[PDB]
Amino acid sequence: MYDYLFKVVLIGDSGVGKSNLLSRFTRNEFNLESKSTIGVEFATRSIQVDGKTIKAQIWDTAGQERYRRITSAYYRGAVGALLVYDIAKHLTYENVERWLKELRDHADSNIVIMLVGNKSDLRHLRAVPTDEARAFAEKNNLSFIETSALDSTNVEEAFKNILTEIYRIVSQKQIADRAAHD
Ligand SMILES: Nc1nc2c(ncn2[C@@H]2O[C@H](COP(=O)(O)OP(=O)(O)NP(=O)(O)O)[C@@H](O)[C@H]2O)c(=O)[nH]1
Ligand SMILES: [Mg+2]
Ligand code: NI
Numbered sequence: 001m002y003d004y005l006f007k008v009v010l011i012g013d014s015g016v017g018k019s020n021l022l023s024r025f026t027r028n029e030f031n032l033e034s035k036s037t038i039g040v041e042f043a044t045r046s047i048q049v050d051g052k053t054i055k056a057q058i059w060d061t062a063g064q065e066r067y068r069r070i071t072s073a074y075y076r077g078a079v080g081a082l083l084v085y086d087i088a089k090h091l092t093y094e095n096v097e098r099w100l101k102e103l104r105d106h107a108d109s110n111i112v113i114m115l116v117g118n119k120s121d122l123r124h125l126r127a128v129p130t131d132e133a134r135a136f137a138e139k140n141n142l143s144f145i146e147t148s149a150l151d152s153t154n155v156e157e158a159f160k161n162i163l164t165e166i167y168r169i170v171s172q173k174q175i176a177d178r179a180a181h182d
């Protein structure tokens, strides 16, 4: 059983590690040789927030949109988005703004967004300083975390954080809504 089913979509440039974040979170698995994502995939994991069972339904799709535009169907019903860039590849961070516009175009206007700087294990190749991404996240009302799907750092935390924020929002909406029914 679960108390909540939260659809959370992974978005971000191809190669940033979205599928490995998914595999790490849902299966504790990581693949150095993962290929670009076929179509759309989702995987689930349930976590407890405030003693409630939150079932995360995490969606994943290839980041490259040149030939294949992500439709609103991908974003539809999503209450969270993990907007992932690769800390070692500045272009993926530069594209965060385009991903934010994609969210505006395709997703619920109140979608919870977490900026995720993935591949923190590549600190020797870091192209995006943490405080820069933080400042950007703060400016854009995004939560922010750096992860490494490879070494697992902050992967649990990233998902738990976004899911908790979503939980906080919908649990409060439920209380309000119940009152409307009363
Ligand atoms: N060093 C390091 N490599 C990572 C990390 N996460 C993913 N990678 C590597 O980055 C490459 C792309 O990962 P992948 O998860 O497939 O990226 P993606 O964002 O899903 N790509 P696509 O959008 O095209 O499906 C793979 O070689 C993968 O092993 C990480 O945290 N650290
Ligand atoms: Mg992928
Ligand atoms: Ni679009």
Ligand code: NI
Pocket: 177, 178, 181
């Ligand atoms: Ni109602």
